[model samples]
Target: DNQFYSVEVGDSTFTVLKRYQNLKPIGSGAQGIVCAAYDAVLDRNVAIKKLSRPFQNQTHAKRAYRELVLMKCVNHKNIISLLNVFTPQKTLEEFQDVYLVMELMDANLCQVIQMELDHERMSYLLYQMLCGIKHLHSAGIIHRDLKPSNIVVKSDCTLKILDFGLARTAGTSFMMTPYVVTRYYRAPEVILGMGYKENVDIWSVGCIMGEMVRHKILFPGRDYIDQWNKVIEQLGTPCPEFMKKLQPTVRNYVENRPKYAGLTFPKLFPDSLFPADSEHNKLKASQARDLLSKMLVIDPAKRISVDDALQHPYINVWYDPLDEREHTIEEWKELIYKEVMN
Candidate 1:
């Protein structure tokens, strides 16, 4: 029997099965949280994720369970490990929270991107995200949320996809409700309030690649309207496909809502927007958006699916993240430490 557990990493305190001093808290997010802890039992760094409690219904619990079940069986070079799972009952408390122990990561893809790197290196980052997505798609898992925030980087700079909260096993049916993503990162279909498929992540990836290149969000839309407006401002207006798929409630969303109309594609994304001026001009916002545009198309069937995206010219010959040397994290730390100390 386990009593209440709390974890300490640096200064922050995170609740776990009980206060386990070995595992340290590293990171967290809105729905579920991740903590990096040194597991004495294994003598290695391990990640522990605490699933958030369900609301009035068991929806949240079911989702969490779904992800864990999928994660347990899915294995790949770029995927994280589900080392073990501990569901301990607190001696003092009747009902206790569950704990998921995963392989600890050194950093996240977002943090790696935040580092000082050249345009060529940025391509490497996008390349890795593609590889990870490729593996996920093959497994019939759709990672609904594919933002950099959910990508974990091990000490070796290799990426492991994380946070499957929004993921769904392929060919399963669920309630079709309104779903949204972070403002600027959302696809037009999501913004248009249409039911979406896995292609959504690819669209988000295109946005992320653009942001990586420009160091700014390509579409910094505020709300749904603001988001759609910014998209039209860049990629031109969405077409009638927008109205075809929305559920009745979403269609009736605007009783007095003015007729939705906006700029068309050629007007929003012209050739001149191609970043032709800079030395880093090899990559263009237009091309990125063009690829994104295909994924963001009004119809999911028309959307440039992930399997199709792997064949894009941008990803085919233009990207590479692997190094000949399989350098370990300790070696990297030594090099950095040597530079700092010297």
Candidate 2:
């Protein structure tokens, strides 16, 4: 047995193992295409991803390079796993296609957000997200990439974040595609182009959690300019201290903007919006609101840390306990090129 087999998805082919059967189209975008299948031997459903345009351009090459490297470098039960990586091409010149397999879940968080979930499920889901993103941040990686679409869940309510890295490029231009989670989940700092740090991505986590509660996009910005306006209007203006760090032109524009006292947690997220208080009486809507308030803060300095968020009363109930080589961008390109051509 060659063990190696070919899968035809239109013009592209997945040279993978014969074990996976009944490949059906699941989802895809500029990032790549995904298919759901069953592993005859492993005896479980698996989702196989064939990255889009691994070497179509330097941009694709650079991204694919880091994506694979980091996929293995940073992995967790909560976050997605590489599971297995393969390509049928055996020789250096023949090695072009790459296939990655991962355990398949029933649905994306986007689907679940539409359903009425109890506070227990909501808090537990956020806990797993925090646990996953915490490990990602510790590994010196950020999900510039986190969104409801990329996150998946089981019928049993278990959550696993898939798609570790951003398939799209940074900023407003990427927003045009509409497939990526751009304007909605982004922190204000990211929108302002202040250049992001570790603390930045947590804001998006806050955005996603709030979205699940309200069953709608929290920021819901129409464009770059409106994105900021949407944020300032809902969360109120950032304090002068945050403004002090802004660029001259930015400050001029920002200072001229109308000020707001912002809505209180109770007013913004009413009791009616929350699931009835947990049966244990430990996970209160108040505690959940507190965590939401901290996460939804406009200023990164004031935003809650991953560790602190996990420790918050709303999350503290689940006290279960819970990495990387550096590489230059250019060096990565070369390595990736070598890999595809090898």
Candidate 3:
């Protein structure tokens, strides 16, 4: 049943379940279109993501499954919850659309990026992100794609990480290309097609936190190649040991490229750029700069771990370690089944 059906702004017709009404387009991306709707059955507002041609190909189908499983598997205050999952079709043969119901938040980090946040709010928000990433890492999950748009926040400044379509399991080393993440927030290891771990997410978190402080993307690259240039332009070239780990051709190309001495964290994130009210008992610009420096390292080996990040002076104020349980394939499948049933 379809209650809301009409041409909306951005020149696209919106259609969704009858249970959800007053649908308004909130966001759109390569994955699918999202709408904010009133869930009549639940008596609350929710964000519904209608995945685009989910079964169109092997890649899309895999993404659909990954998002569905990961959303149900991970449970944390800082991670978005999957309220319900539904499909219009009753049978597998006709199952093409997948709609995921998620808690509606005040806004995404993109909108919040423009706001002027003092140290307390900024540090707490960053703390939540690290907590969420730590939860995923503890479960061997790697959030391959992290950007401001994927992170949502409430008016109270609470943050939640979402969009697990690009996430994968950690531990195994594999070639990671830069295209996985938005160019501006990509980790240097990813740009070089090198093996990466949980620290990659930390790098993205670092970029997001820097953007929060600077009120703009820290590494706004023009292209994929430019993305690497943008990173080295500030973080400087990778150490020779890190370079030796790359494929010979990649190492050769990187070695032949221009070498940058890099700007110090103080220079990159100046005291003048920080809010003046930062001195009050919460977080300080100096502590924040130290954390950023550890997180934004070009070498994954040198990048700070989620555990260590939580312990950093700037973020440790909110750190309370959770006894995270690892979910097995069967356990995850069972959780997915339960989610589908609910």
Candidate 4:
């Protein structure tokens, strides 16, 4: 259980003080919770947050501190912007809780794409995900936990990642919550108990692409083996060079890697994973399936990179840049590439 504190800070809070408005709780998160506050001076609605009690515990206090610290460094338009981070007043009765105020967000990625929306919107949503991720990667941030649930889609259709509690800086090693991301959205390294990096974000992005099209996870498996098997069934076995790099527990992990082995991917997933409604439909289905298959590969080295996935033909087949937030996909790509390189 968590307690709530109601003191405001930051530039926005000054406006709230000018005009007498109220704050209301809208959502409850694991470490902290969010609330909708009406700023009287600005005459606009804003969201304020307070630290939760469970987070006040000594064990999690430092983690909460770090999460806020990280957000301090990476707030941007493409990502969730932290409106303010404040320390609550220590009152006579109880110590007021410190809170982090953020721009009030509407729906998460799971809600946006899962809802009955036009395919056009879904593609736009995916593009934004990529762009935001590209920003994080360029900053050397991994966002180790990049699942749909952590993604918040605003009322204006802008998608913002909600929680960075599990996120770690790239090249920095740290033990994580035994149960990290949702099993299905988790990349193979996470599932296989191996150290992972930003590549996991690419894996989640690929899963999101599949979900956008099929309305279901391509490999709806229960564990690592099941996830690996489902991927193998759809993509055929990994190449020998790949197998030599996998763990013994992987469903297809092997010792003596053979050079040439023809695999029947279609037969392995004839019915569900590789469903084709028609010939024209089969072409699109196969293309989408192949892209997803590679991302879900058990071996981390074989999995796609965020940059590589952006360059992928599958993305070009789906992304139409003209209506995508004023900039075409090609233009956006060039801009991001230049920004990252320089």
TM-score (all chains, Cα) for each model: 0.67, 0.85, 0.84, 0.65
Q: Write the per-residue lDDT of candidate 3 for residues 114-174, one digit (tens) a residue.
A: 8887777888998898888888878777776788878888889999888662434333223
User: Compared with the true structure, what per-residue lDDT tens digits does model 4 show for residues 41-75?
Assistant: 55667666555332333234434444555566785
lDDT of 2: 0.73
Worst 10 residues of 2 by lDDT: 168-177
Error in Å for residue 184 of model 1: 4.0
| lDDT, candidate 2, 229-294, per-residue tens | 878887888899988878888888888988877777788888888766565534477787889899
Any residue pairs clashing in model 4, and if so which?
A: 321-329
For residue 237, model 4's alpha carbon misses the true position, in angstroms, by: 5.4
CA lDDT, every model vs. true structure: 0.56, 0.73, 0.74, 0.56
Report the Cα lDDT for candidate 3.
Answer: 0.74
RMSD of each: 12.0, 4.3, 5.9, 11.4
lDDT of 1: 0.56
Scored against the true structure, residue 252 in model 1 reaches a CA lDDT of 60
Q: Can you write out model 1's per-residue Cα lDDT over 235-270, one digit (the tens) per residue?
A: 544456555566777656532344445544445454
Off by over 4 Å in 4: 1-32, 54-59, 91-96, 165-181, 217-240, 246-290, 313-342
Query: What TM-score should be assigned to candidate 4?
Result: 0.65
The better-scoring model by TM-score among 3 and 4 is 3
* Candidate 2 lDDT score at position 172: 20
